[PDB]
């Protein structure tokens, strides 16, 4: 009743988000490195 937060749902969200975290992290990081204008 007053508990549960979808383990499978959060499991796929955690794993998925994780991938995106490293994807956006490396994307942004590499983005700057690629940019590094001025």
Interface contacts to a copy of itself, rule CB under 8 A: 1-11, 13-14, 17-18, 20-21, 24-25, 27-28, 31-32, 35, 37
CB of 25 to a copy of itself, least distance (A): 6
CB of 10 to a copy of itself, least distance (A): 5
Give the whole-angstrom CA distance, residue 5 versus residue 16.
16
Look at residue 3 and give its three-state secondary structure: coil
CB of 35 to a copy of itself, least distance (A): 4
Give the whole-angstrom CA distance, residue 14 versus residue 7.
10
């Amino acid at each position: 009743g007053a508990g549960s937060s979808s383990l499978e749902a959060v499991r796929r969200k955690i794993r998925s988000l994780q991938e995106q975290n490293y994807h956006l992290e490396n994307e942004v990081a590499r983005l700057k490195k690629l940019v590094g204008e001025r």
